[PDB]
Amino acid sequence: APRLPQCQGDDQEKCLCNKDECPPGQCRFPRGDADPYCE
Secondary structure, X not given: OOOOOEOOOOOOOOXXXXXXXXXXXXXXXXXXXXXXXXX
């Protein structure tokens, strides 16, 4: 499992989407009480 930073919102490099190892761009952030999903 690679050592990845935490995602922000449509990223430059590979990062954790909530707790999911996800490629740059595809980490999506839904509103309210919904957790960040890897697309």
